[PDB]
Every structure is written in structure tokens, then in C-alpha cells.
């Protein structure tokens, strides 16, 4: 993530993904900073352990399996569910199971609004905060 660049494709991407991934690159930029500062576990600050728990959350969100590409409206919501809250319950292991739990249990009519409008409207920002609270997360 630190070396991969796309500046011509940036400011040409999905508008809804551009809202939720600016913090995803941000919370991954700090995650590489505080993993470089803690090369071993003896010192625990508990304000960087928030970054180690959110950075390991977002890394598990970004990894996907082969020959199954994800549409951009089902990919914006899964990063919306991870850069914000809605996944701090799950430890690190069931996040791949929680992502398919988020995508399947959330109403598929909210994916049509994000696709057709292009971005997360505040009418849809409220509804998708609401639909992400009635998701049965597998880490309990």
C-alpha cells in the first residue's frame, strides 16, 4: 500500500468509494507507521493498540479470494462497514466471514441506490448506518 501509486486514476474513481477510502488509506498510513515503531511486543501504548486493531481489521477486509471480483457498490459498503464502526466486535479472524455477513444480510436495494446515484447521499448515509446495525456479526 505504501508503494502502490495511481494518481491519474485518482480523482476519476467511484465517488462513493472516494468518501470511504480516504480514511482507509489514512488508517493504513498510520498502521504502517506504528507497526514500524513496534517491531516487537514489549511496549504497549493502548492508543496505538487502537491502530493495531483497526489496521488489522482493514487488512482482513481488503484481502479477497481468487476469481470472484466484487462490484463497486458491494465494495464501497464493506469499506463503509470497516473504516467506521460495525466491525470492532469481530476480533480479526471472522472479518472475512463478517464481510459476507454484511453483504448478504444488508438489503440489496441499498446497493442499487449507491450504484445509480454514484455516491453515498445523506439519505443513504443514514439508511446504511441503520442497516449495518441489524447485521448478525459472527464474532460474538
Amino acid at each position: 500500500v505504501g508503494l502502490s501509486v495511481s494518481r491519474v486514476g485518482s480523482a476519476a474513481q467511484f465517488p462513493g468509494m472516494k468518501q470511504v477510502a480516504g480514511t482507509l488509506k489514512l488508517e493504513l498510513a498510520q498502521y504502517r507507521e506504528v507497526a514500524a515503531f513496534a517491531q516487537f511486543g514489549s511496549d504497549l501504548d493502548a492508543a496505538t493498540q487502537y491502530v493495531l486493531e483497526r489496521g488489522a481489521r482493514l487488512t482482513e477486509m481488503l484481502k479477497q479470494k481468487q476469481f470472484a471480483p466484487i462490484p463497486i457498490e458491494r465494495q464501497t459498503v464493506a469499506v463503509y462497514a470497516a473504516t467506521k464502526g460495525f466491525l470492532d466486535k469481530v476480533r480479526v479472524q471472522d472479518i472475512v466471514a463478517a464481510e459476507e455477513a454484511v453483504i448478504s444480510q444488508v438489503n440489496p436495494a441499498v446497493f442499487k441506490i449507491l450504484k445509480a446515484n454514484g455516491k453515498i447521499t445523506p439519505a443513504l448515509d443514514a439508511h446504511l448506518k441503520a442497516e449495518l446495525r441489524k447485521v448478525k456479526l459472527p464474532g460474538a
Binding site: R7, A11, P122, D125, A126, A130
Partner: protein, 104 residues
């Protein structure tokens, strides 16, 4: 190899000042804001000589390293050391009283 624990504290002041001036040499560009998001800062010549002389004499050893990263002049290192300090308290209180409820 040995880490910073084996340094003399005359040499720890070197590493602390040099990590500060290494970050302070960087700045955001007005042509790079289209992909970085940070607006660009034109820094006058009198402000770079004034800013780096303070870090050399020791006037800004109070501030952390990341206050010097991607800022225009030494007025903005102090403006960013507060924002960094301010957000070490504020991290929460977005629970209720939203624009996101049912009817509004």
C-alpha cells in the same frame, strides 16, 4: 542494530533534531493537492531560514516529529502540534443527536 537505547544523550539530541528537520524539509505542493488532498504551501525564503534555525538552536524540541511533516512554515508546526494534541483527547462522542435518524 543496537537501537537508540545505546546512544549517548548528546547523540540522542542529534537523532531527535535530525528526524525533526528531515520531516520539516518536506512540504505539500500546490500541484500535488489533486492527489494528496493536502493544500500546497508556498514558503518564503525568510521563513525557511527562520524555521530551520529554531530547530538547530533547540527552540522546538518540545514538539513531536509529526508536527513537522507536510507543513509550510514554523507557524504551522505549532498549528499542527495542537491539532495532534487536541485529537489525543477527542476521539468519540458521535453516539446520538445525528442527522441520521428516522424522520428528519
Amino acid at each position: 542494530i543496537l537501537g537508540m537505547d545505546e546512544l549517548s544523550e548528546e547523540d540522542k539530541l542529534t537523532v531527535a533534531r535530525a528526524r525533526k528537520i528531515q520531516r520539516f524539509l518536506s512540504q505539500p505542493f500546490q500541484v500535488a493537492e489533486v492527489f494528496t488532498g493536502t493544500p500546497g504551501k508556498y514558503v518564503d525564503l525568510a521563513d525557511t531560514i527562520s524555521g530551520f534555525q529554531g530547530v538547530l538552536t533547540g527552540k522546538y524540541d518540545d514538539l513531536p516529529e509529526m508536527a513537522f511533516y507536510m507543513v509550510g512554515d514554523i507557524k504551522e508546526v505549532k498549528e499542527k502540534a495542537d491539532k495532534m494534541a487536541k485529537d489525543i483527547a477527542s476521539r468519540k462522542e458521535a453516539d446520538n443527536k445525528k442527522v441520521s435518524e428516522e424522520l428528519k
